[PDB]
Structure 1
Amino acid sequence: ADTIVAVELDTYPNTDIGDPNYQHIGINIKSIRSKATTRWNVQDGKVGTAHISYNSVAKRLSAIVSYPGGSSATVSYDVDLNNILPEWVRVGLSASTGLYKETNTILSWSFTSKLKTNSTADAQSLHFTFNQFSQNPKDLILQGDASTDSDGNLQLTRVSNGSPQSNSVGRALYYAPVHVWDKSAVVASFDATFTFLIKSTDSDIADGIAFFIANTDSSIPHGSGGRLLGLFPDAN
Protein backbone atom coordinates (compact mmCIF):
# COMPACT_ATOMS: atom_id res chain seq x y z
CA ALA A 1 0.00 0.00 0.00
CA ASP A 2 1.30 3.43 -1.10
CA THR A 3 0.97 6.69 0.83
CA ILE A 4 -0.81 9.21 -1.36
CA VAL A 5 -1.44 12.96 -1.16
CA ALA A 6 -3.37 14.40 -4.11
CA VAL A 7 -5.27 17.29 -5.65
CA GLU A 8 -8.00 15.95 -7.90
CA LEU A 9 -9.77 17.63 -10.77
CA ASP A 10 -12.81 15.33 -10.60
CA THR A 11 -14.93 15.30 -13.73
CA TYR A 12 -17.51 12.63 -12.78
CA PRO A 13 -19.73 12.64 -9.67
CA ASN A 14 -19.43 9.31 -7.84
CA THR A 15 -21.84 10.07 -5.01
CA ASP A 16 -21.67 6.42 -3.89
CA ILE A 17 -18.06 7.05 -2.82
CA GLY A 18 -18.57 10.45 -1.28
CA ASP A 19 -18.32 12.81 -4.23
CA PRO A 20 -20.50 15.88 -4.18
CA ASN A 21 -23.21 15.63 -6.83
CA TYR A 22 -21.21 17.84 -9.22
CA GLN A 23 -17.81 18.21 -10.85
CA HIS A 24 -15.27 19.27 -8.24
CA ILE A 25 -11.66 19.82 -7.18
CA GLY A 26 -10.59 17.94 -4.06
CA ILE A 27 -7.76 17.49 -1.60
CA ASN A 28 -6.99 13.87 -0.91
CA ILE A 29 -5.04 12.53 2.05
CA LYS A 30 -4.63 8.70 1.97
CA SER A 31 -8.09 8.24 0.47
CA ILE A 32 -10.10 8.85 -2.68
CA ARG A 33 -12.67 10.41 -0.37
CA SER A 34 -11.47 14.04 -0.43
CA LYS A 35 -10.96 15.81 2.89
CA ALA A 36 -12.30 18.96 1.15
CA THR A 37 -14.01 19.73 -2.12
CA THR A 38 -15.32 22.75 -4.05
CA ARG A 39 -17.74 22.88 -6.98
CA TRP A 40 -15.89 23.14 -10.32
CA ASN A 41 -17.27 23.60 -13.83
CA VAL A 42 -15.21 21.76 -16.43
CA GLN A 43 -15.03 23.80 -19.63
CA ASP A 44 -15.02 21.03 -22.20
CA GLY A 45 -12.47 21.72 -24.90
CA LYS A 46 -10.58 24.52 -23.13
CA VAL A 47 -7.09 24.66 -21.63
CA GLY A 48 -7.22 24.90 -17.84
CA THR A 49 -4.56 25.89 -15.31
CA ALA A 50 -4.03 24.53 -11.81
CA HIS A 51 -1.68 25.89 -9.10
CA ILE A 52 -0.91 23.83 -5.99
CA SER A 53 0.82 25.02 -2.84
CA TYR A 54 2.15 23.89 0.45
CA ASN A 55 4.41 25.22 3.16
CA SER A 56 5.25 23.21 6.29
CA VAL A 57 5.02 26.31 8.48
CA ALA A 58 1.54 27.30 7.31
CA LYS A 59 0.66 23.59 7.10
CA ARG A 60 -2.02 24.31 4.54
CA LEU A 61 -2.31 22.58 1.18
CA SER A 62 -4.19 24.65 -1.37
CA ALA A 63 -5.13 24.49 -5.01
CA ILE A 64 -6.82 26.75 -7.45
CA VAL A 65 -7.94 25.88 -10.92
CA SER A 66 -9.10 28.40 -13.51
CA TYR A 67 -9.95 28.82 -17.18
CA PRO A 68 -9.40 31.85 -19.45
CA GLY A 69 -12.47 34.01 -18.85
CA GLY A 70 -11.80 33.84 -15.14
CA SER A 71 -13.97 31.01 -13.95
CA SER A 72 -11.85 29.72 -11.07
CA ALA A 73 -12.51 27.35 -8.14
CA THR A 74 -10.28 26.96 -5.05
CA VAL A 75 -9.90 24.35 -2.26
CA SER A 76 -7.80 24.18 0.96
CA TYR A 77 -7.09 21.81 3.80
CA ASP A 78 -5.18 22.32 7.01
CA VAL A 79 -2.87 19.34 7.37
CA ASP A 80 0.63 18.63 8.56
CA LEU A 81 2.07 16.57 5.68
CA ASN A 82 5.30 16.35 7.64
CA ASN A 83 3.84 13.40 9.47
CA ILE A 84 1.98 11.90 6.51
CA LEU A 85 4.58 11.86 3.74
CA PRO A 86 7.78 9.88 3.93
CA GLU A 87 11.01 11.83 3.93
CA TRP A 88 11.57 11.02 0.24
CA VAL A 89 8.71 11.08 -2.25
CA ARG A 90 8.00 11.25 -5.97
CA VAL A 91 5.71 13.76 -7.62
CA GLY A 92 3.37 13.07 -10.49
CA LEU A 93 0.23 13.43 -12.52
CA SER A 94 -2.40 10.81 -13.08
CA ALA A 95 -5.68 10.53 -14.93
CA SER A 96 -8.33 7.93 -15.68
CA THR A 97 -11.31 7.10 -17.87
CA GLY A 98 -13.95 4.46 -17.06
CA LEU A 99 -17.16 3.86 -18.99
CA TYR A 100 -17.33 7.56 -19.81
CA LYS A 101 -14.21 9.17 -21.21
CA GLU A 102 -12.30 12.42 -21.89
CA THR A 103 -8.86 13.34 -23.16
CA ASN A 104 -6.63 13.91 -20.13
CA THR A 105 -3.96 16.02 -21.81
CA ILE A 106 -1.17 17.84 -19.96
CA LEU A 107 0.20 20.75 -21.97
CA SER A 108 2.75 21.95 -19.39
CA TRP A 109 3.91 21.15 -15.84
CA SER A 110 6.11 22.97 -13.24
CA PHE A 111 7.29 21.97 -9.84
CA THR A 112 9.43 23.63 -7.20
CA SER A 113 10.53 22.06 -3.96
CA LYS A 114 12.51 23.50 -1.02
CA LEU A 115 14.07 22.05 2.12
CA LYS A 116 15.73 24.49 4.43
CA THR A 117 17.31 25.14 7.76
CA ASN A 118 19.75 27.91 8.72
CA SER A 119 20.06 30.14 5.62
CA THR A 120 18.90 31.65 2.31
CA ALA A 121 20.80 29.02 0.39
CA ASP A 122 18.88 26.07 1.69
CA ALA A 123 20.07 22.51 2.22
CA GLN A 124 17.98 21.30 -0.78
CA SER A 125 15.82 22.39 -3.74
CA LEU A 126 14.51 21.04 -7.01
CA HIS A 127 12.90 22.87 -9.89
CA PHE A 128 11.51 21.50 -13.12
CA THR A 129 9.51 23.00 -15.94
CA PHE A 130 7.99 21.27 -18.96
CA ASN A 131 6.27 23.52 -21.49
CA GLN A 132 6.25 20.53 -23.76
CA PHE A 133 7.17 16.87 -23.46
CA SER A 134 9.55 15.13 -25.86
CA GLN A 135 8.80 11.96 -27.86
CA ASN A 136 10.79 9.87 -25.36
CA PRO A 137 10.75 11.76 -22.02
CA LYS A 138 13.60 10.09 -20.11
CA ASP A 139 13.01 12.13 -16.98
CA LEU A 140 9.42 10.87 -16.65
CA ILE A 141 8.44 7.45 -15.33
CA LEU A 142 5.39 6.65 -17.49
CA GLN A 143 2.87 4.24 -16.01
CA GLY A 144 -0.08 2.45 -17.65
CA ASP A 145 -1.33 4.20 -20.78
CA ALA A 146 0.63 7.46 -20.28
CA SER A 147 2.61 8.63 -23.32
CA THR A 148 3.51 11.73 -25.28
CA ASP A 149 2.03 12.72 -28.62
CA SER A 150 3.73 14.50 -31.52
CA ASP A 151 2.38 17.95 -30.64
CA GLY A 152 4.56 17.55 -27.55
CA ASN A 153 1.65 17.03 -25.17
CA LEU A 154 1.48 14.31 -22.50
CA GLN A 155 -1.64 12.15 -22.88
CA LEU A 156 -2.08 10.47 -19.50
CA THR A 157 -4.84 8.16 -20.84
CA ARG A 158 -5.34 6.46 -24.28
CA VAL A 159 -6.27 8.56 -27.28
CA SER A 160 -6.87 7.09 -30.79
CA ASN A 161 -6.69 9.61 -33.65
CA GLY A 162 -7.33 12.47 -31.16
CA SER A 163 -10.28 10.47 -29.73
CA PRO A 164 -10.27 9.20 -26.09
CA GLN A 165 -10.82 5.54 -25.06
CA SER A 166 -12.67 3.75 -22.26
CA ASN A 167 -11.14 2.31 -19.07
CA SER A 168 -7.69 3.86 -19.39
CA VAL A 169 -5.23 4.74 -16.58
CA GLY A 170 -1.94 6.61 -16.87
CA ARG A 171 0.56 8.37 -14.65
CA ALA A 172 3.80 10.33 -15.14
CA LEU A 173 6.12 10.84 -12.20
CA TYR A 174 9.25 12.93 -12.33
CA TYR A 175 12.35 10.68 -12.42
CA ALA A 176 14.22 12.13 -9.46
CA PRO A 177 12.85 11.60 -5.91
CA VAL A 178 12.06 14.83 -4.05
CA HIS A 179 13.52 15.40 -0.56
CA VAL A 180 10.51 16.69 1.39
CA TRP A 181 11.80 16.11 4.92
CA ASP A 182 14.91 15.70 7.04
CA LYS A 183 15.73 15.37 10.78
CA SER A 184 17.32 18.79 10.62
CA ALA A 185 14.67 20.44 8.51
CA VAL A 186 13.18 23.77 9.49
CA VAL A 187 10.84 24.41 6.55
CA ALA A 188 9.64 22.45 3.53
CA SER A 189 7.58 23.79 0.66
CA PHE A 190 6.46 22.76 -2.78
CA ASP A 191 4.63 24.41 -5.68
CA ALA A 192 3.05 22.90 -8.75
CA THR A 193 1.44 24.28 -11.87
CA PHE A 194 0.07 22.39 -14.79
CA THR A 195 -2.09 23.23 -17.76
CA PHE A 196 -4.56 20.62 -19.05
CA LEU A 197 -7.10 19.85 -21.78
CA ILE A 198 -10.24 17.91 -20.92
CA LYS A 199 -12.11 17.36 -24.13
CA SER A 200 -14.75 15.01 -25.49
CA THR A 201 -17.31 15.04 -28.28
CA ASP A 202 -19.67 13.46 -25.75
CA SER A 203 -20.99 15.45 -22.82
CA ASP A 204 -20.87 12.88 -19.99
CA ILE A 205 -17.16 12.69 -19.18
CA ALA A 206 -14.89 10.86 -16.72
CA ASP A 207 -12.96 10.48 -14.57
CA GLY A 208 -10.44 13.24 -13.96
CA ILE A 209 -6.85 14.36 -13.51
CA ALA A 210 -4.85 14.43 -10.28
CA PHE A 211 -1.51 15.84 -9.17
CA PHE A 212 -0.12 13.51 -6.53
CA ILE A 213 2.74 12.97 -4.13
CA ALA A 214 3.65 9.38 -3.20
CA ASN A 215 6.35 7.12 -1.83
CA THR A 216 9.15 6.93 -4.39
CA ASP A 217 8.37 3.42 -5.60
CA SER A 218 4.63 4.07 -6.14
CA SER A 219 2.92 2.34 -9.04
CA ILE A 220 -0.66 2.17 -10.30
CA PRO A 221 -2.52 0.16 -7.64
CA HIS A 222 -4.48 -2.85 -8.77
CA GLY A 223 -8.10 -1.91 -9.47
CA SER A 224 -7.39 1.81 -9.35
CA GLY A 225 -9.22 2.39 -12.66
CA GLY A 226 -12.03 4.84 -13.44
CA ARG A 227 -13.31 6.54 -10.29
CA LEU A 228 -10.15 5.90 -8.23
CA LEU A 229 -8.05 7.96 -10.72
CA GLY A 230 -5.12 5.52 -10.75
CA LEU A 231 -4.29 6.49 -7.14
CA PHE A 232 -6.04 4.06 -4.76
CA PRO A 233 -6.58 0.30 -4.63
CA ASP A 234 -10.09 0.81 -3.19
CA ALA A 235 -12.79 3.47 -2.49
CA ASN A 236 -11.19 4.45 0.86
Structure 2
Amino acid sequence: ADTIVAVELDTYPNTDIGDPNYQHIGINIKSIRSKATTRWNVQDGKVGTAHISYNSVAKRLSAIVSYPGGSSATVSYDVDLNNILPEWVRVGLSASTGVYKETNTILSWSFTSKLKTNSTADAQSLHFTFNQFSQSPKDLILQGDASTDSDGNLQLTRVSNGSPQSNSVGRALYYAPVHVWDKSAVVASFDATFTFLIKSPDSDPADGIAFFIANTDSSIPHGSGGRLLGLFPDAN
Protein backbone atom coordinates (compact mmCIF):
# COMPACT_ATOMS: atom_id res chain seq x y z
CA ALA A 1 0.00 0.00 0.00
CA ASP A 2 0.94 3.70 -0.45
CA THR A 3 2.66 5.80 2.25
CA ILE A 4 0.38 8.81 2.99
CA VAL A 5 0.90 11.97 4.96
CA ALA A 6 -2.12 14.20 4.55
CA VAL A 7 -4.02 17.19 5.84
CA GLU A 8 -7.79 16.52 5.55
CA LEU A 9 -10.55 19.17 5.48
CA ASP A 10 -13.21 16.74 6.57
CA THR A 11 -16.79 17.80 5.83
CA TYR A 12 -18.76 14.84 7.14
CA PRO A 13 -18.44 13.19 10.55
CA ASN A 14 -17.81 9.40 10.30
CA THR A 15 -17.99 8.46 14.01
CA ASP A 16 -17.34 4.77 13.37
CA ILE A 17 -13.83 5.37 12.07
CA GLY A 18 -12.69 8.00 14.58
CA ASP A 19 -14.06 11.30 13.26
CA PRO A 20 -15.08 13.73 16.05
CA ASN A 21 -18.84 14.66 16.06
CA TYR A 22 -18.34 17.76 13.83
CA GLN A 23 -16.61 18.88 10.54
CA HIS A 24 -12.94 19.14 11.22
CA ILE A 25 -9.42 19.69 9.92
CA GLY A 26 -7.12 16.75 10.61
CA ILE A 27 -3.58 15.47 10.38
CA ASN A 28 -3.36 11.97 8.83
CA ILE A 29 -0.20 9.88 9.24
CA LYS A 30 -0.51 6.51 7.41
CA SER A 31 -4.13 6.36 8.56
CA ILE A 32 -7.53 7.95 7.99
CA ARG A 33 -7.89 8.04 11.77
CA SER A 34 -6.40 11.48 12.24
CA LYS A 35 -3.62 11.86 14.80
CA ALA A 36 -5.02 15.32 15.67
CA THR A 37 -8.12 17.31 14.74
CA THR A 38 -9.71 20.69 15.31
CA ARG A 39 -13.29 21.73 14.98
CA TRP A 40 -13.92 23.55 11.66
CA ASN A 41 -17.12 24.99 10.23
CA VAL A 42 -17.69 24.64 6.52
CA GLN A 43 -19.23 27.81 5.06
CA ASP A 44 -21.38 26.48 2.23
CA GLY A 45 -20.36 28.02 -1.04
CA LYS A 46 -17.62 30.36 0.23
CA VAL A 47 -13.96 30.36 -0.91
CA GLY A 48 -11.73 28.86 1.79
CA THR A 49 -7.91 28.95 2.05
CA ALA A 50 -5.73 26.23 3.69
CA HIS A 51 -2.08 26.60 4.76
CA ILE A 52 0.22 23.66 5.63
CA SER A 53 3.83 23.85 6.79
CA TYR A 54 6.47 21.63 8.27
CA ASN A 55 10.14 21.58 8.89
CA SER A 56 12.35 18.78 9.93
CA VAL A 57 14.12 20.52 12.84
CA ALA A 58 10.92 21.65 14.50
CA LYS A 59 9.21 18.39 13.50
CA ARG A 60 5.73 19.78 13.72
CA LEU A 61 3.24 19.51 10.88
CA SER A 62 0.67 22.36 11.21
CA ALA A 63 -2.42 23.31 9.18
CA ILE A 64 -4.86 26.16 9.21
CA VAL A 65 -8.01 26.74 7.27
CA SER A 66 -9.82 30.10 7.07
CA TYR A 67 -12.65 31.92 5.34
CA PRO A 68 -12.80 35.71 4.74
CA GLY A 69 -13.93 37.91 7.69
CA GLY A 70 -13.99 34.69 9.76
CA SER A 71 -11.90 33.06 12.42
CA SER A 72 -9.73 30.18 11.42
CA ALA A 73 -9.27 26.57 12.57
CA THR A 74 -5.72 25.33 13.12
CA VAL A 75 -4.27 21.94 14.03
CA SER A 76 -0.77 20.68 14.81
CA TYR A 77 0.96 17.37 15.36
CA ASP A 78 4.54 16.57 16.39
CA VAL A 79 5.91 14.12 13.82
CA ASP A 80 9.25 13.34 12.20
CA LEU A 81 8.15 12.94 8.58
CA ASN A 82 11.62 11.97 7.39
CA ASN A 83 11.31 8.66 9.28
CA ILE A 84 7.99 8.07 7.55
CA LEU A 85 8.15 9.30 4.03
CA PRO A 86 10.56 8.08 1.39
CA GLU A 87 13.34 10.35 0.09
CA TRP A 88 11.26 11.13 -2.99
CA VAL A 89 7.60 11.83 -2.96
CA ARG A 90 4.82 13.41 -4.95
CA VAL A 91 2.42 15.98 -3.49
CA GLY A 92 -1.24 16.47 -4.31
CA LEU A 93 -4.80 17.19 -3.47
CA SER A 94 -7.67 14.75 -3.33
CA ALA A 95 -11.32 14.78 -2.69
CA SER A 96 -14.30 12.43 -2.57
CA THR A 97 -18.03 12.29 -2.15
CA GLY A 98 -20.22 9.34 -1.07
CA VAL A 99 -23.93 9.21 -0.37
CA TYR A 100 -23.58 12.85 0.52
CA LYS A 101 -21.92 15.25 -1.89
CA GLU A 102 -20.31 18.65 -2.52
CA THR A 103 -18.18 20.52 -5.07
CA ASN A 104 -14.52 19.86 -4.37
CA THR A 105 -13.25 22.81 -6.40
CA ILE A 106 -9.65 23.99 -6.08
CA LEU A 107 -9.19 27.64 -7.16
CA SER A 108 -5.50 27.78 -6.59
CA TRP A 109 -2.62 25.79 -5.23
CA SER A 110 0.95 26.54 -4.35
CA PHE A 111 3.73 24.40 -2.86
CA THR A 112 7.29 24.93 -1.75
CA SER A 113 9.87 22.33 -0.76
CA LYS A 114 13.43 23.03 0.43
CA LEU A 115 16.31 20.68 1.26
CA LYS A 116 19.48 22.16 2.80
CA THR A 117 22.52 19.83 3.00
CA ASN A 118 25.69 20.45 5.03
CA SER A 119 28.07 21.76 2.31
CA THR A 120 26.52 24.73 2.66
CA ALA A 121 24.39 24.51 -0.47
CA ASP A 122 20.95 26.03 -0.66
CA ALA A 123 20.83 22.38 -1.90
CA GLN A 124 17.61 21.66 -3.82
CA SER A 125 14.25 23.39 -4.06
CA LEU A 126 10.88 23.37 -5.83
CA HIS A 127 8.20 26.02 -5.84
CA PHE A 128 5.01 25.78 -7.91
CA THR A 129 1.93 28.02 -8.03
CA PHE A 130 -1.34 27.74 -9.83
CA ASN A 131 -4.00 30.50 -9.55
CA GLN A 132 -5.91 28.83 -12.24
CA PHE A 133 -5.71 25.61 -14.17
CA SER A 134 -5.13 25.05 -17.82
CA GLN A 135 -7.86 23.08 -19.58
CA SER A 136 -5.17 20.53 -20.32
CA PRO A 137 -2.63 20.72 -17.44
CA LYS A 138 0.41 18.76 -18.64
CA ASP A 139 2.26 19.25 -15.32
CA LEU A 140 -0.49 17.57 -13.29
CA ILE A 141 -1.23 13.90 -12.97
CA LEU A 142 -5.00 13.72 -12.96
CA GLN A 143 -6.48 10.69 -11.24
CA GLY A 144 -10.02 9.30 -11.09
CA ASP A 145 -12.69 11.99 -11.64
CA ALA A 146 -10.38 15.03 -11.40
CA SER A 147 -10.63 17.52 -14.29
CA THR A 148 -10.33 21.24 -14.93
CA ASP A 149 -13.48 23.16 -15.94
CA SER A 150 -13.81 26.05 -18.37
CA ASP A 151 -13.47 28.69 -15.61
CA GLY A 152 -10.02 27.13 -15.02
CA ASN A 153 -10.98 25.64 -11.66
CA LEU A 154 -9.68 22.21 -10.73
CA GLN A 155 -12.75 20.03 -10.08
CA LEU A 156 -11.40 17.17 -7.99
CA THR A 157 -14.85 15.41 -7.90
CA ARG A 158 -17.64 15.15 -10.52
CA VAL A 159 -19.89 18.04 -11.17
CA SER A 160 -22.50 17.71 -13.96
CA ASN A 161 -23.77 21.21 -14.62
CA GLY A 162 -23.60 23.08 -11.31
CA SER A 163 -24.45 19.85 -9.54
CA PRO A 164 -21.89 17.76 -7.53
CA GLN A 165 -22.14 13.98 -7.96
CA SER A 166 -22.27 11.30 -5.30
CA ASN A 167 -19.65 8.47 -5.00
CA SER A 168 -16.94 10.40 -6.85
CA VAL A 169 -13.23 10.41 -6.20
CA GLY A 170 -10.38 12.51 -7.71
CA ARG A 171 -6.74 13.56 -7.23
CA ALA A 172 -4.19 15.84 -8.83
CA LEU A 173 -0.48 15.32 -8.21
CA TYR A 174 2.26 17.75 -9.32
CA TYR A 175 4.18 16.09 -12.19
CA ALA A 176 7.67 16.29 -10.60
CA PRO A 177 9.01 14.13 -7.78
CA VAL A 178 10.09 16.21 -4.74
CA HIS A 179 13.29 15.45 -2.91
CA VAL A 180 12.37 15.62 0.80
CA TRP A 181 15.36 14.18 2.60
CA ASP A 182 18.92 13.24 1.72
CA LYS A 183 21.81 11.46 3.56
CA SER A 184 23.83 14.66 3.98
CA ALA A 185 20.63 16.57 4.80
CA VAL A 186 20.61 19.29 7.50
CA VAL A 187 17.00 20.65 7.30
CA ALA A 188 14.05 19.94 4.96
CA SER A 189 10.88 22.05 4.85
CA PHE A 190 7.69 22.49 2.87
CA ASP A 191 4.72 24.88 2.78
CA ALA A 192 1.57 24.48 0.68
CA THR A 193 -1.44 26.80 0.20
CA PHE A 194 -4.67 26.01 -1.59
CA THR A 195 -7.98 27.83 -1.96
CA PHE A 196 -11.10 25.77 -2.38
CA LEU A 197 -14.83 26.04 -2.86
CA ILE A 198 -17.10 23.45 -1.18
CA LYS A 199 -20.87 23.76 -2.02
CA SER A 200 -23.80 21.41 -1.51
CA PRO A 201 -27.55 21.65 -2.17
CA ASP A 202 -28.07 19.05 0.67
CA SER A 203 -28.20 20.27 4.30
CA ASP A 204 -25.21 17.95 4.80
CA PRO A 205 -22.03 18.05 2.65
CA ALA A 206 -19.54 15.13 2.17
CA ASP A 207 -16.74 14.07 2.21
CA GLY A 208 -13.83 16.52 2.12
CA ILE A 209 -10.57 17.68 0.52
CA ALA A 210 -7.05 16.67 1.49
CA PHE A 211 -3.53 17.81 0.73
CA PHE A 212 -1.18 14.86 0.72
CA ILE A 213 2.33 13.63 0.22
CA ALA A 214 2.93 10.04 -0.97
CA ASN A 215 5.34 7.65 -2.71
CA THR A 216 5.90 9.01 -6.20
CA ASP A 217 3.83 6.20 -7.80
CA SER A 218 0.81 6.60 -5.49
CA SER A 219 -2.56 6.17 -7.21
CA ILE A 220 -6.17 6.11 -5.93
CA PRO A 221 -6.50 2.93 -3.76
CA HIS A 222 -9.34 0.45 -4.41
CA GLY A 223 -12.18 1.07 -1.99
CA SER A 224 -11.06 4.58 -1.04
CA GLY A 225 -14.28 6.47 -1.80
CA GLY A 226 -16.42 8.60 0.50
CA ARG A 227 -15.03 8.79 4.03
CA LEU A 228 -11.52 7.53 3.03
CA LEU A 229 -11.00 10.61 0.91
CA GLY A 230 -9.22 8.79 -2.00
CA LEU A 231 -6.23 8.44 0.34
CA PHE A 232 -6.58 4.99 1.94
CA PRO A 233 -7.73 1.40 0.97
CA ASP A 234 -9.29 0.97 4.41
CA ALA A 235 -9.92 2.56 7.70
CA ASN A 236 -7.15 1.10 9.90
Quickly name the TM-score band, shorter chain normalised: over 0.9
What is the distance in 2 between the residues matched to 1:105 and 1:203? 19
Distance 1:7 1:119 in 2: 33
Q: 1:12-58: per-residue Cα shift (whole Å, max 9, x none)?
A: 00000000000000000000000000000000000000000000000
Residue 119 of structure 1 deviates from its aligned partner by 6.2
Shift of 1:71: 2.1
Do 2:90 and 2:174's aligned partners in 1 also have CA atoms closer than 8 Å? yes
Contact 2:118–2:185 at 8 Å: present in 1 too? no
Superposed displacement of residue 120, structure 1? 6.7
3-state DSSP of counterpart to 2:82: helix
The C-alpha deviation readout for 1:184-214, integer Å capped at 9, x for no partner, is 1000000000000000122211000000000
**Distance in structure 1 (CA, Å) of the matches to 2:9 and 2:96:** 11
| Aligned-partner Cα distance in 2 for 1:42–1:67 | 9
State the distance in 2 between where 1:100 and 1:162 align.
Answer: 16
The DSSP-based 3-state class of the residue aligned with 2:185 is coil
Give me the TM-score of the superposition, normalised by structure 2. 0.99
Instruction: Measure the CA separation in 1 of the matches of 2:176 and 2:116.
Output: 19
Q: How many angstroms apart in 2 are the aligned matches of 1:119 and 1:190?
A: 20
Q: Secondary structure at the match of 1:186?
A: strand
Q: For structure 1, which segment, 195-204 or 168-177, has the greater mean C-alpha deviation from structure 2 after superposition?
A: 195-204
Structure 1 consecutive aligned stretches of length 4 or more whose deviation exceeds 3 Å: 118-121
- Counterpart contact for 2:118–2:184, Cα < 8 Å: no
Distance 1:57 1:202, change over 3 A: same
Q: TM-score, normalised by structure 1?
A: 0.99
Alignment check: 8 A CA contact 2:10 2:26 kept: yes
Percent of aligned pairs with the same amino acid: 98
Q: Secondary structure at the match of 1:193?
A: strand
Give unpaired runs (5+ residues) of structure 1.
none
In the alignment, what sits opposite 2:192?
A: 192
Kept after mapping to 1: 8 A contact 2:3/2:214 = yes
In structure 2, what is the Cα distance between the partners aligned to 1:143 and 1:227? 18
Give the match for residue 18 of structure 1: 18
Task: Note if contact 2:115-2:179 (Cα within 8 Å) is conserved in structure 1.
Answer: yes
Q: Distance in 2 between matches of 1:35 and 1:14?
A: 15
Residues 162 and 120 of structure 1: CA distance in aligned 2, closer, same or farther (over 3 Å): farther
Deviations 1:128-161 (A, max 9, x none): 0000000000000000000000000000000000
Q: Aligned partners of 1:45 and 1:22: how far apart in 2?
A: 18
